[PDB]
Design a protein around this ligand. Structure first.
Ligand SMILES: [Ca+2]
Length: 448
């Protein structure tokens, strides 16, 4: 009974069935009424339908008297950065992120790149749009093109001490998304030697959709690292707000361990700061943050929750195990570019490889990775797990799903709201055998 494209935090649908130019134009009209006064930043990714959808959105916005700042082909974080930097009323990124070829969508922010979520105006937009039968007016406002990325590039470079960088050899895999454009603009300013895989933006995606979690995109990056003796490799999704790391042996690094590493890299520059993290996997982050003289702050997962928690806490850094990294100085927003700059600086300064930096943490806190279960009844499955372990008296916490701490091991179990789907994360204190038995034990209880 409601427009399916409108989800909890953004708009996502197949083109043109769930998302199309007419909906885009009506979203522009509706957005103009929810924002404070000021112009609106618009950007788009490499997908074939993205320019058209952005044009439709510009039309609806300008018909409603909003000036539009078109920043052209970009990553999502550039929309966040420019919205904040130009003191704009809001910003829209047109992007399908990592989704199949027939998909597109939008990420909406208001002033200072604050998220527009279902709680905070997205559903007011949905309702307005679903009720708008009126004819398209004419633009009574201007579209200015502002494709200069200089302020954004200078901001990125300010996170590192360039005199401390060594000439590392880095594999970069844009997946034919947008990240290669940024790498080429940064490269004149850095000592690194880049090895470019799937580099050119290409909305036909001849090498597969830009999703580095797909094993063939994983293997292309790992092979390039090994074949070229790179210090590490970096891959991004298509709008590059997510960054994934491969060490010099070609091993894919589970995102959990990057949270603690980036935290200690940041706390070295801004000592005593707060670090926000999500409850799925926690023990490594807490230890690394405290060892670096910081304070960890637990928060619900999901970018809307982490951003608002960082604002309220004046947190310097927040990280999710799912490759989302947020920085206070970047308008409390996520970037897929800052993380690898910080990692390259840490490797350069420490004389330790990325492999050695993480291997120590992996041995201390082995984790299962996120495991998904389609079940008949989420409530019954969860109850089966809780009843089975109740005699061990775990410490429970309900920040985000159920987290049960048993002393030597813990798990987090979250249920999707859109479907009967359970997501499981397990970790232990230095015990890989315990990790695997409990993971299989829970897997059995969840299934049967
Ligand atoms: Ca993305």
């Amino acid at each position: 009974m409601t427009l399916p494209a409108f989800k909890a935090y953004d708009i996502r649908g197949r083109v043109p069935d769930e998302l199309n130019e007419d909906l885009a134009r009506r979203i522009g009209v509706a957005l103009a009424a929810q924002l404070d006064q000021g112009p609106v930043v618009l950007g788009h990714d490499v997908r074939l339908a993205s320019p058209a959808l952005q044009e439709a959105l510009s039309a609806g916005l300008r018909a409603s008297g909003r000036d539009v700042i078109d920043i052209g082909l970009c990553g999502t974080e550039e929309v966040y950065f420019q919205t904040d930097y130009l003191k704009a009323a809001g910003g829209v990124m047109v992007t399908a992120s990592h989704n199949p070829m027939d998909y597109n969508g939008m990420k909406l922010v208001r002033e200072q790149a604050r998220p527009i979520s279902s709680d905070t105006g997205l559903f007011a937009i949905r309702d307005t749009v679903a009720a708008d039968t009126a004819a398209p007016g004419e633009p009574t406002a201007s579209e200015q093109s502002r494709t200069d990325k200089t302020a954004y590039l200078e901001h990125l470079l300010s996170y590192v001490d360039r005199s401390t960088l060594k000439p590392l050899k880095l594999v970069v895999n844009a997946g034919n998304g947008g990240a290669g454009l940024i790498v080429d603009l940064l490269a004149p300013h850095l000592p690194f030697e880049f090895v470019r895989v799937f580099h050119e933006p290409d909305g036909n995606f001849p090498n597969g959709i830009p999703n580095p979690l797909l094993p063939e995109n994983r293997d292309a990056t790992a092979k390039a690292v090994k074949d070229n003796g790179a210090d590490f490799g970096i891959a991004w999704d298509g709008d590059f707000d997510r960054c994934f790391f491969f060490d010099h042996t070609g091993r894919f690094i589970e995102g959990y361990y990057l949270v603690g590493l980036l935290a200690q890299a940041i706390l070295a520059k801004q000592p005593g700061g707060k670090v926000v993290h999500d409850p799925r996997l926690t023990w490594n982050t807490v230890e690394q943050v405290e060892e670096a003289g910081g304070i960890p702050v637990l928060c619900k997962s999901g970018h809307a929750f982490i951003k608002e928690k960082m604002r309220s806490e004046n947190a310097v850094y927040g990280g999710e195990m799912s490759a989302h990294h947020y920085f206070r100085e970047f308008a409390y927003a996520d970037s897929g570019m800052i993380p690898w700059l910080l990692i390259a600086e840490l490797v350069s300064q420490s004389g330790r490889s990325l492999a050695d930096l993480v291997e120590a943490r992996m041995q201390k806190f082995p984790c299962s990775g996120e495991i998904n279960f389609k079940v008949a009844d989420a409530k019954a499955s969860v109850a089966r797990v809780m009843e089975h372990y109740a005699s061990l008296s775990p410490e429970l916490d309900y920040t985000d799903g159920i987290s049960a701490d048993f002393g030597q091991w813990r798990f987090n179990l979250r249920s999707s709201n859109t479907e009967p789907l359970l997501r499981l994360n397990v970790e232990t204190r230095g015990d890989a055998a315990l990790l695997e038995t409990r993971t299989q034990e829970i897997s059995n209880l969840l299934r049967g």
